[model samples]
Target: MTISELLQYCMAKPGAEQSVHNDWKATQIKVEDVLFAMVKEVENRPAVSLKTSPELAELLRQQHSDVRPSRHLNKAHWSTVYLDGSLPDSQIYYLVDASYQQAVNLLPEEKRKLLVQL
Candidate 1:
């Protein structure tokens, strides 16, 4: 999917939204108010960088050869899923869901509860 399409999908999720806060590129998506994903346009390609675990990170790198360390994140814990449309939309959605879940899982109990109720 295109960057715009991906952003639209995320924003359409319940309690999800886009934010430019602290974004030098003005392309970031968050769950509730916490950032979970960021978008970057590189050489005309739209890439999605999502927070993830090391296990998921390596799996994605292996599955999507195009995936790579995020340009601006913890390299070992985040990856950039290239928006080449080579992967199925379902898989991409799954990655998004995983990223969201990973972020939520790491949230403090109080923050997690608030977001969950949103």
Candidate 2:
């Protein structure tokens, strides 16, 4: 699937929040205001920039040509991944999950449990 399906998936998560940057025409997804990923376009191709551990980010770019360092964010922790590319959609989705948890880990314990409550 293209970033289209992924976009829907991103918004569907529980307690998932987003900010649309009209100037950049991009969207940043977060949990408790802790950014997890950035949805943007590069060269008109849909891309998702995700936050990951320094080691994982480095390893991903090394193994996947479609994944690269984020253009407008921290290069070491943020990675921009192309939607329609060699990487399997499942893997990309997996990264999104990791990114989400990564952000949640930064949030305080109060809001953390509240987020899971219906």
- TM-score for each of the candidates: 0.70, 0.80
**lDDT, candidates in the order shown:** 0.68, 0.73
lDDT, model 1? 0.68
lDDT, candidate 2, equals 0.73
Which residue pairs does candidate 2 place in steric collision? none
Where does model 2 exceed 4 Å of error? 58-66, 70-72, 85-87
Q: In model 1, where do residues sit more than 4 Å from their true spots? A: 21-26, 31-33, 60-74
Q: What TM-score, to 2 decimals, does candidate 2 have?
A: 0.80
Query: What pairs collide in candidate 1?
Result: none
lDDT of 1 by residue, 1-118 (tens): 5555767788766556667646457477776557777777665676677766565667755765455554555566666766665656777778777777767776788777877676
